[PDB]
Amino acid sequence: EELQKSIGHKPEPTDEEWELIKTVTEAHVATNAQGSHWKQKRKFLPEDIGQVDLEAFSHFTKIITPAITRVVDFAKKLPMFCELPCEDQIILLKGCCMEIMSLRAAVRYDPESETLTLNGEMAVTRGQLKNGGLGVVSDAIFDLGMSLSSFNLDDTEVALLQAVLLMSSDRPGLACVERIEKYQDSFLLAFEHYINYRKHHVTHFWPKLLMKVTDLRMIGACHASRFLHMKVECPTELFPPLFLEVFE
């Protein structure tokens, strides 16, 4: 593998890697709430709502349960994820949930209206998402989305990104650190090959793309912190049970 790099050939996916790519892709596609048809489908959250504004908060938490479960359904469709013990599966899910959800919203960013679209249906602006409880985390996700425009990602690259986030062998508490590292590596390798095959005409695409992983981990972490700030303001009543399970 390093030899071909040396000779300057950019390896495309092996047949086994194509199988894994099809699986992850299909997993994302089956749980990503598009469309190909999001955006003739989105209703714009009224300009006055979210002008912590609890009214805005209520709209987000109304659809958050489905958004979260869609992330769990994704992981469920990856066999490697199934080989892991219940404790790990849960620790992995709680670790990547917001990284994956914020990626999913970021890739639905629209320059025209300057809106992200949540859960495939609700288009919000930067201010509305900030004020509905995300604060600077909203800025982070909008800046990310603006930035991902020119990466021209496809369903496959978004799915691989998700699986790479999911298989983070460094979440606290994990039993199978080694096995989870191996899965991720296998995802990163398929991913990179897939990118060589895709021949994006951006220089240093792969490293640039990996920096996005780091940003999403930051978004996750900063969200954990926003979550505390919310528990103190908004009344625990307003938080859906699954929302609480995942982040507390």
Ligand X SMILES: O=C(O)Cc1cc(I)c(Oc2ccc(O)c(I)c2)c(I)c1
Q: How many CA atoms lie within 13 A of 158 on its CB side?
A: 26
Chain residues 2-61 in contact with ligand X, contact rule CB under 6 A: 33, 57, 60
Q: Nearest approach, Cβ of 246 to ligand X (angstroms)?
A: 10
By CB under 6 A, is residue 162 in contact with ligand X? no
By CB under 6 A, is residue 64 in contact with ligand X? yes
Residue 206, C-beta contacts closer than 8 angstroms, at least 6 positions apart:
192, 195
Give me the residues paired with residue 44 across strands: 123
By CB under 6 A, is residue 119 in contact with ligand X? yes
Residue 227: its H or E element: helix 205-232
Among 20, 24, 118, 148, which residue sits at the site for ligand X (rule: CB under 6 A)? 118
Residue 126 is labelled as binding a ligand: no
Distance in angstroms between the alpha carbons of the first and the last residue of the chain? 43
Residue closer to ligand X by CB (options 64, 176) is 64
Chain residues 197-226 in contact with ligand X, contact rule CB under 6 A: none
Check: CB of residue 95 under 8 Å from CB of residue 168.
Answer: yes
Chain residues 68-87 in contact with ligand X, contact rule CB under 6 A: 70
By CB under 6 A, is residue 130 in contact with ligand X? no
CA distance 168 to 45: 34
Q: Nearest approach, Cβ of 50 to ligand X (angstroms)?
A: 10
CA distance 68 to 246: 8
Among 54, 63, 188, 189, which residue sits at the site for ligand X (rule: CB under 6 A)? 63
Q: Nearest approach, Cβ of 36 to ligand X (angstroms)?
A: 16
CA distance 63 to 122: 9
Residues of the chain with a following break (C to N over 2.5 Å):
51
Residue with tokens 């609890």: 54
Q: Nearest approach, Cβ of 49 to ligand X (angstroms)?
A: 13
Give me the residues paired with residue 117 across strands: 123
Give me the residues paired with residue 118 across strands: 122
Name the segment binding ligand X (CB under 6 A); options: 22-30, 100-108, 174-182, 185-193: 100-108
Q: Nearest approach, Cβ of 47 to ligand X (angstroms)?
A: 18
CA distance 243 to 248: 8
Name the segment binding ligand X (CB under 6 A); options: 64-72, 73-81, 151-159, 203-211: 64-72
Residues forming contacts to ligand X in the complex (CB under 6 A) are 33, 57, 60, 63-64, 67, 70, 101-102, 104-105, 118-119, 132-134, 141
